[PDB]
RNA sequence: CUUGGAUUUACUGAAGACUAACUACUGCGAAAGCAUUUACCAAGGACGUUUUCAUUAAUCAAGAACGAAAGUUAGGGGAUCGAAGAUGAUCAGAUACCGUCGUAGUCUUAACCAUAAACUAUGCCGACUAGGGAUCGGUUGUUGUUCUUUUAUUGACGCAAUCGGCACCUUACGAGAAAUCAAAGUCUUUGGGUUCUGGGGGGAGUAUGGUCGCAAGGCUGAAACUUAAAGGAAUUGACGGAAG
């Protein structure tokens, strides 16, 4: 059977899409069926804010911010539990959980 | 008509020298042999001589060139490359 | 057989008959 | 709706529609009397100006082609005819 | 078996005077013996330092100068601009998706001989009162505001000495200068000069050294 | 856009053609404009434009060879050089 | 002289001492390349035909362009007679008899 | 006033180092990885080995007249994972808990504006 | 691989590739495909038009253009990955997965090859049938907004109409074996025009003849014989080195 209407990707509208290799696995992948990830984190683990406060010399010197994208194929984010299997009735959900 | 399907000008070969080389030869027998257009008087009588050599019929012009074709690929790159580092330099 | 191997298979099978035809023309 | 007026359409939606949509088709472009602040002279122009129409011996340009209905110039007047 | 820290001369290093603070940091070398001088030595090494350290303003804080010395007076070793950076952490901040990245780079001359390569970076800003999901400008316009990047540094680059072309780095006022002469094309926001690299250097001239650290 | 100017010229106004038509023409006085493929030889060049310097006539100097400047005036022949003798409903005079 | 030409100029003809008139790249369709410039020392590196690199005094001569008769060997001889044509011109070196004959 | 190093932490998933240089990056003042602090392959990763690896460093950093450092960060970089490695943060620590002054920390791992092709095949690593 | 200093640090340089981040239920193209700047070349859809011709049209055997990747020939390049090969582990064995190299290849130029789950597994042209909110391009009317200037013939943004698109959401008119479908509807109340294809499963896309290709192969394409099911969608259960 068809399992989804949009074939588990995003091309509606044309042939081809340059593919994207997977963080772990290095897998090719479309990147419009990649599972892309915009992550924002503290460069210094929280437990550690206060002694690196302590030990700076600067005051009132900002902590710089991590910016990276992640991609991943659909193994590699179904395995480390990035996505998960839903559903029938609630595969059809595009808006984000909360 | 067509006398030959696909020798063409290496038909004088025969059967000799195998398919290949003389494939090989064809190529560049019809260049060798063309007639060009002449960047002196713009007519098309530019003709072999010897290799290198490239004579125009009507305004007597002979100009350095290719074994079998009048300009190289190589010899034009360099007349753009020749041309480019000249402004660079003079500016 | 996964039927991409079947026809693998077959190929080959069929380079091969092609040889043994052409040694008697 | 089960029951319409296909035969009386309301104005405002005849008025709403595409040139060719209408019970009729109809051009809903017209025939502007151009006239620049300097002289008198009259000058008819088609609204959607593909040219840049002039005027008389006054010797000036009155509209500039655009992908639409042609913009007049700085300092003329129209009338719809 | 040696011990190599005990072979070392700590020089100090010392930015011009364009800047703030000149008491930039300390280095190490192997002293000048007969047969390895402490001279030629320090000659070329490359200081990459925060402009927040060198304007006492956090305001400075992501764009890191680079700083290479070209002469030594005893213990002082003088150097000169070098390139401008941003930091990684602000650049991949700016980077945001649902807007138009636009970029731009020049090769240009100094009025002292001094080729650059200057890179422009701005993104399109959202109305105040926006409402449609993302804020993409027209191909042609960014087209449009490319060129006016270009044309903006250029003029504004070629027209002062380098010196004075790293006093007029740090107020970013080309970078405002984008800002201001594009509204017409499309409003911009986080416009900047975030790059710029030293190509090829003239010849080299005291005279005209001793005069950014007089 | 001279090959358009050029084109109109000879729809419309008058010429002639050819180097041996143009000298004589610059000894007359007729001509109005003197054309050069850029192939012309120079010593022929160089030539014309002294007889174009006695007899104050323009010179314009086409980009292309004489198979193009042939190819341009509507003919299926080179044009080594070519003068205008009336511009016709042609503004070349003035757009040069 | 190479010094007087930028980088990545094509020249042939070229002299490896100055005023020895021409030892390298003077072949059909070969040529030298001149990588880079020492003017501090009066010396310009190129690149020979080979792929060998060479520095060469700056104030040595080359001619500006490729050999002239390019792509000679793209075509086959085909025959014995065409070589023996070949090298009835240049010196007494053909036909080879192979040493296992003899 | 404080004295200023660069140390230059490269945290990856099979070791980590911590490597003190003067503020051009020329001089080397020490270099200990964890492969120095365990002596089994699997734990050069770990944080207590960068941990200690830091305070080593540390101690020679001292001793040699270095006062404070400036953090140079990077995971493996270029076609590899961008996320550092498991020994920085755990070395990051212990630099500021060692009486060393820590200056401005940043991130400098190698991206490529589209590079080279990743090793393992376009199936990739299959496990 | 490393005391011949490997790895790690800074500067300069040399190569070939690639075009990150921006990048999306967004754009263009007949399809395959197409993503750094700029300039030139010719091309194109849509829109606007009270411009022009007047049936010039639709679909199409035969016959043609283009056609990812891999592969072929000859030059040039050959950084990186890397079929084959060599080699270390795991293993009962692994000439596999994993690790280290690494030849073709990957790139380009001039020619071949003509196939993909080349997929929307949905021919093309035309008409009609139900509601909604977005988005891209063009055009048409319009502000408590931001920008030029504070003011125009600014630009962006905001609010309503339309034409064209890529799509999406709800319902089940109606359809369907169902999964599901605004077309897969207007089909036993069976007929708008037209091209191609299928007729139980295998044997078999095989043999043979023809034909194209340098080859690899492509296109066209049977029969004997064999067999009671093969298959589609969904249900309940059981099971999973699947999740909670
Ligand atoms: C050496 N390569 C071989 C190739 O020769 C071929 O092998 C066939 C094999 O398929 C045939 O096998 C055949 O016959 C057997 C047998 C029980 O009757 C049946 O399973 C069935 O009819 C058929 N598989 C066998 N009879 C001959 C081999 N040469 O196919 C397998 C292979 C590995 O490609
Ligand atoms: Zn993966
Ligand atoms: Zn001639």
Same mark, same amino acid.
Do not use: Q
């Given at each position: 059977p068809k399992k989804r209407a949009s074939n588990g990707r995003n091309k509606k509208g044309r042939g081809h899409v340059k593919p994207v290799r997977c963080l772990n696995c290095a897998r090719c992948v479309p990147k419009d069926k990649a599972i892309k990830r915009v992550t924002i984190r503290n460069m210094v683990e929280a437990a550690a804010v206060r002694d690196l406060s302590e030990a700076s010399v600067y005051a009132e010197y900002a902590l710089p911010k991590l910016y990276n994208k992640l991609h991943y194929c659909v193994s590699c984010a179904i395995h480390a539990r990035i996505v998960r299997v839903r559903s029938r009735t609630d595969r059809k959900i595009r808006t984000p959980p909360q | 008509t067509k006398r030959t399907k696909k020798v063409g000008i290496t @038909?004088?070969? @025969?059967?000799?020298?195998g398919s290949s080389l003389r494939r090989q030869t064809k190529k560049l027998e019809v260049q060798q042999h063309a007639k060009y257009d002449c960047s002196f008087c713009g007519k098309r009588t530019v003709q072999r001589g010897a290799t290198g050599i490239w004579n125009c019929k009507s305004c007597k012009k002979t100009v350095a060139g290719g074994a079998y074709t009048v300009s190289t690929a190589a010899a034009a790159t360099v007349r753009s490359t020749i041309r480019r580092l000249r402004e660079l330099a003079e500016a | 057989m996964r039927d991409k191997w079947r026809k693998k298979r077959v190929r080959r099978l069929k380079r091969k008959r092609r040889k043994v035809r052409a040694r008697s023309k | 709706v089960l029951v319409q007026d296909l035969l009386h359409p309301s104005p405002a939606t005849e008025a709403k529609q595409h040139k060719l949509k209408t019970l009729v088709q109809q051009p809903r472009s017209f025939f502007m009397d151009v006239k620049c602040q300097g002289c008198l002279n009259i000058t008819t122009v088609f609204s959607h100006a593909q040219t840049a129409v002039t005027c008389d011996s006054c010797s000036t340009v009155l509209c500039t082609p655009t992908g639409g209905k042609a913009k007049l110039t700085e300092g003329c007047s129209f009338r719809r005819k | 078996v040696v011990d190599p820290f005990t072979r070392k001369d700590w020089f100090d290093i010392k930015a011009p005077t364009t800047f703030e603070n000149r008491n930039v940091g300390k280095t190490l070398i192997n002293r000048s013996t007969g047969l390895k001088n402490a001279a030629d030595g320090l000659k070329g090494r490359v200081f990459e330092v925060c402009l927040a350290d060198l304007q006492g303003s956090e305001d400075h804080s992501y764009r890191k100068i680079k700083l290479r010395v070209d002469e030594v007076q005893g213990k002082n070793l003088l150097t000169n601009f070098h390139g401008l950076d941003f930091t990684s952490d602000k650049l991949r901040s700016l980077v945001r998706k649902w807007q138009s990245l636009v970029e731009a780079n020049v090769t240009v001359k100094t009025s002292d001989d001094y080729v650059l390569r200057v890179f422009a970076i701005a993104f399109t800003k959202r109305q105040p009162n926006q409402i449609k999901k993302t804020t993409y400008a027209q191909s042609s316009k960014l087209r449009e505001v490319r060129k006016k990047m270009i044309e903006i540094m250029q003029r504004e680059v070629s027209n002062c000495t380098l010196a004075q072309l790293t006093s007029k780095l740090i107020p970013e006022v080309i970078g405002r200068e984008i800002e201001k002469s594009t509204q017409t094309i499309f409003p911009l926001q986080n416009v900047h000069i975030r790059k710029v690299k030293l190509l090829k250097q003239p010849k080299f001239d005291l005279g005209s050294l001793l005069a950014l650290h007089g | 856009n001279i090959n358009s100017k050029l084109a109109l010229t000879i729809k419309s106004g008058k010429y002639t053609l050819g180097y041996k038509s143009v000298v004589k023409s610059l000894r007359t006085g007729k001509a109005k404009l003197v054309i050069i493929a850029a192939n012309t030889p120079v010593l022929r060049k160089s030539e014309l434009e002294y007889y174009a310097m006695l007899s104050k006539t323009p010179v314009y100097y086409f980009q292309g060879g004489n198979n193009e400047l042939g190819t341009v005036c509507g003919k299926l022949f080179r044009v080594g050089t070519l003068s205008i003798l009336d511009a016709g409903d042609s503004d070349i005079l003035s757009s040069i | 002289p190479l010094g007087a030409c930028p980088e990545g100029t094509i020249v042939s003809n070229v002299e490896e001492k100055v005023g020895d008139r021409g030892a390298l790249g003077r072949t059909s369709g070969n040529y030298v390349i001149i990588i880079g410039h020492n003017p501090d020392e009066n010396k310009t590196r190129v690149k020979l035909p080979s792929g060998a690199k060479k520095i060469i005094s700056s104030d040595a001569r080359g001619v500006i362009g490729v050999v002239a008769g390019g792509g000679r060997i793209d075509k086959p001889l085909l025959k014995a007679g065409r070589a023996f044509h070949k090298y009835k011109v240049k010196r007494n070196s053909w036909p080879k008899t192979r040493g296992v004959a003899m | 006033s404080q004295v200023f190093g660069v140390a230059r932490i490269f945290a990856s998933f099979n070791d980590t180092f911590v490597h003190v240089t003067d503020l051009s990056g020329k001089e080397t003042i020490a270099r200990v990885t964890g492969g120095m602090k365990v002596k089994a392959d699997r734990d050069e990763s770990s944080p207590y080995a960068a941990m200690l690896a830091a305070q080593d460093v540390a101690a020679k950093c001292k001793e040699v007249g270095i006062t404070a450092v400036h953090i140079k960060l990077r995971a493996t970089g270029g076609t590899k994972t961008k996320t550092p490695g498991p020994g920085g943060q755990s070395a990051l620590r212990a630099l500021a808990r060692s009486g060393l002054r820590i200056g401005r920390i940043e991130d400098v791992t190698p991206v490529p504006s589209x590079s080279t092709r990743r090793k393992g095949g376009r199936r990739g690593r299959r496990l």
């Open positions: - | @038909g004088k070969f @025969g059967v000799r020298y | - | - | - | - | - | -």
